Amino acid sequence: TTRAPGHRAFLSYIEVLTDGSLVGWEHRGALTLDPGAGEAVLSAQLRSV
Amino acid sequence: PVLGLTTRMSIYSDKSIHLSFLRTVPPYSHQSSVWFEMMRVYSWNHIIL
Numbered sequence: 001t002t003r004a005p006g007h008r009a010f011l012s013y014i015e016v017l018t019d020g021s022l023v024g025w026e027h028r029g030a031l032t033l034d035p036g037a038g039e040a041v042l043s044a045q046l047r048s049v
Numbered sequence: 050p051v052l053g054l055t056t057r058m059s060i061y062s063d064k065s066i067h068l069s070f071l072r073t074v075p076p077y078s079h080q081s082s083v084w085f086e087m088m089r090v091y092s093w094n095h096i097i098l
Contacts, residue, residue: 005065
């Protein structure tokens with residue numbers, strides 16, 4: 001996700017829906033990216049998925 | 050952009066409605082941080098609000 005408005009509420013809804021399930025969802029991670037850093041800056045950490 | 054003066058209203062804090070609002074006076078909801086400090090210095094617990 002980016003810093004666009006509503007992103008705080010967006011990720012908060014993942015944990016409630018990914019918990020208490022017999023399917024057993026695994027969370028790879030949460031990524032916070034800012035477009036203003038630079039085009040090449042994002043690829044430095046985006047590859048860590 | 051708009052600058053707010055002498056306006057303490059916690060509604061103007063979610064950017065999903067007010068895209069660009071800035072103020073020079075802390076809002077009413079920020080008062081809660083004061084009560085926490087008074088709670089620990091005076092050794093208080095078991096509160097009801």
